[PDB]
Symmetry: C4
Subunit: 302 residues, 4 copies
């Protein structure tokens, strides 16, 4: 496995991150085991994933692994309770969420606590002072944000610096096909000392090259493009030339960005987890990157 | 039920708040149950109400309700012990009050801790640093004030902003008849990101229209006005035209103010609680508001 | 009993403070009981008094009294352990002292924690950040100083204001005979919002009028003055004219200073404690104060 | 024993510090006992020394000694776990290291927690806010650094002052032969209120005078100097003239620097510990210091 700093911080994450997004218990547990076996250190989940089930299964699967060998990331913000305080980023919801996450993960601290979507109803002073109280308490170490507006990332990072809350992580959608964060988000985050942990790097199967024309919700939207699956198939020669699968090429491609700390995989197939983990440390030649862009053409979203 | 932000905060309160101000245990418990059944989320009490009895009964009645579904507000400042440190807003009295309130309410945090009347003997730096220590400790989330001078509200809000203490709530007397807070208090609070949770909205029965001329202490003072009960009776046609009781019109009237987060009801009649709760989300036409003012005339206190 | 604010704070102390300075256990316990019976709320001790014995006896005697009715003051700084970290005001000694004081006093917080003598070896930033940590932790509420240089009082008060540590109390030697603090200490403390709790108000028996010429250490130094005991005897007519004992006149005299919050008594005679407590609320006429100064003449230390 | 302030702080350390650097358990335990018997108060160790064994043995040997009589120093930064978060000075590694050190040392606080080597991967804001959280929590009292660049010492001291983290200790290599820290490190530390606790004062046996030409790693490098052992032998007359062993002269020499708080000894011979401890309080005449420099000549590293 290869490792990167998560932004401007002393924290190191595995270049491949296992994200058990929610399937029977045994399939999830065996997939997490496969990730550990492959040298993955960094595990991502959320309170909302399988409504607490993802956190509980990660807690069980990681039990016994020395705490210093694991980077545990979870989230708060999506609805996990009834009524208007059962969601969002208020001091109330964040304070009522953290102890449940700690108990289900079977730990006394979370490495990276991520604000799941920006909450326009919560003043950033209210949220960042709540994070300050949890860092002072030793319940969370570092703060992340998921799919936030760039201006709110910068505001949060500023307040965090003032309050001694490390703001080190952003979790975008980023793949060979989905490049929206390259314009403003990744540049701003690099300026602010924030690293990306990338979601949907295999675009829910589209970038595996396993699916032929005429053979999730993201995959649904991709199928509005009548050329994308045919274009991914044409990557296989490019991948094989570099001694990679199409999936390994997709994961390696995301890791070529110096703003990226890690790429998330979520496969429930033990063999795919081990193969996808070997994407770490792979350098792609510039000529390979040029003809990837030529093959995918106007299927790429900028 | 309808919900509002409590000032500039991520906290949402029910537009109707149940305030069990202090009657046998069973009447109080059944009234709180009626409020829960009506979709009321936000409950107000104080250490001093029935000398600890109100907090203990709210703790019992709300037991089993998921914590994230409830907004629990209590108070400190009125006398609950003997001698000059048994009252007021000193670090000593506030620190010696909070654990009793938590134990009686059966919770590990209070959503809104309200300073019950301004204490000229306590420096606001002393009080606001005490609130800071309780927010850091996770014992209180948000701070309120009850019937404070506007200048002390602004001072408290300033210090709170500096110390990361959310100051989000003021509890005035506010009704169709008692409009004193409109002049300075509500305008200043809106400027400071503070929402009103309104007390005596039914003026201890005067604004129910149930009481005829010649048929609590506030009701005592109202009866010095030889026209007020007759004027409230003349609202019934206006209420019925809008498909409301006089009590529902009174509660709806307070909620028409954009500075108001919630209106407190305290009825011990299960049927009245359910009826009064349906005041939430009711919009009053401007013409209705004009002739309310015409009917009540010089009985209104500005 | 009469009460005063302890400096610019919300804390109220009894004008008569019981200080069990160190005699058999039973004499100490019965004297504390006598003070409680007389309406004394405010008790002073120190780790060093009878090497932990004073704190343990106060803890036992005050057991059962509601916490809100008591103001418990203790001290740190004098030697209570072996070696150079067994004394002074270092973070180490203060942090290793506080839990012992809490356990012996049988409380979870000390109202007033007093720095017993200024420690030139400890930076005031080091001491005041230690006090900050104990206030944040809820182990101490308010900070005092005993016989400090005026410049270090002002420095401590400044840092305290910045860190949200209430600095409200100074404990001088102050009596009808010992007036050294009037020149600079009391004026500066009044400016800084600090109240005096006065020690040696009866000058170890000299100001009781019980001791005749030819009939601790402070009393030793007083006997170098060949006129002081004769001069105190001549106060008895002045005292009796005002319906006071000489001891009550001495205690009342200290309380005439607007900079004084409280006067400490330490008598082991139950009858004297009850009599001395009645000094509270006594106003002395200006003509009485003038002829006190005439009677004592050059025995007074300025 | 003689004592010094550890930098600008209220903490006093013994001029001789026992450092059980890692031999059977019994030899280590008896050596620590010998140090206690000699009046040594100040004990240094590290998580990494004998991989947790040094801390566990110090915890056992010091059990029963009153806490106020001991200054316990340990370290974090060197590898104690697998993978890239099992070492360095990240919030993660520091937070995951401190409770192990407390449990093995059998204490609820460490007097001096030393950052073992500068970590270029961790922002000093991240490290110093972690130290702030541990000082607030009462788990560590004072902060040290070991063999840091002078510019990072100054940066850390600045942030520490702002956050109320006492930065009081630097642990250089310093001996009669190794004088590198005299140029910049000791001068800067004296300016910043930091005292030295000196390692390798006997240069792993070279400065004992026990080893003849032709009779570890530091001793290995010294033997590249074909004159150093012969030059140390020529100190014996100088030592004997002052009533010292060569080892006592070496330890006394380090203590002549006003920037030095303490000199570390690590001997496993009970007799050597007691003899070396008597180096404390020894003043060396200027003429003695001049001819030491003449005897050692170009063997000294500046």
């Amino acid at each position: 496995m290869e490792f990167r700093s998560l932004g401007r911080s002393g924290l190191s994450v595995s270049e491949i991150v296992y994200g058990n997004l929610l399937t029977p218990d045994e399939v999830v547990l065996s997939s997490i085991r496969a990730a550990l076996d492959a040298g993955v250190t960094t595990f991502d989940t959320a309170d909302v994933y399988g409504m607490f089930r993802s956190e509980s299964l990660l807690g069980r699967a990681l039990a016994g692994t020395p705490r210093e060998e694991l980077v545990l990331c979870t989230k708060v913000g999506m609805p996990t309770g009834f009524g208007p305080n059962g969601r969002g980023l208020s001091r109330k919801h964040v304070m009522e969420s953290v102890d449940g996450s700690l108990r289900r993960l079977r730990v006394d601290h979370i490495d990276v606590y991520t604000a799941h979507r920006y909450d326009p109803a919560t003043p950033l002073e209210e949220l960042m002072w709540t994070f300050s109280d949890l860092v002072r308490a030793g319940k969370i170490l570092y703060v992340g944000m998921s799919e936030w507006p760039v201006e709110r990332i910068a505001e949060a990072a500023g307040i965090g610096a003032r309050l001694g809350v490390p703001v080190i992580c952003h979790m975008p959608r980023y793949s060979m096909l989905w490049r929206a964060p390259e314009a403003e988000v990744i540049p701003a985050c690099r300026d602010l000392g924030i690293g990306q942990i990338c979601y949907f790097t295999l675009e829910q199967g589209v970038l595996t090259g396993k699916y032929a024309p005429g053979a999730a919700p993201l995959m649904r939207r991709w199928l509005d493009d009548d050329k994308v699956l045919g274009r991914v198939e044409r990557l296989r020669p490019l991948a094989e030339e570099a001694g990679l699968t199409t999936a390994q090429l997709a994961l390696a491609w995301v890791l070529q960005n110096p703003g990226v700390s890690g790429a998330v995989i979520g496969s429930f197939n033990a063999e795919q987890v081990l193969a996808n983990a070997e994407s770490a440390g792979v350098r792609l030649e510039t000529d390979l990157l040029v003809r990837i862009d030529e093959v995918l053409g106007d299927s790429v979203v900028h």
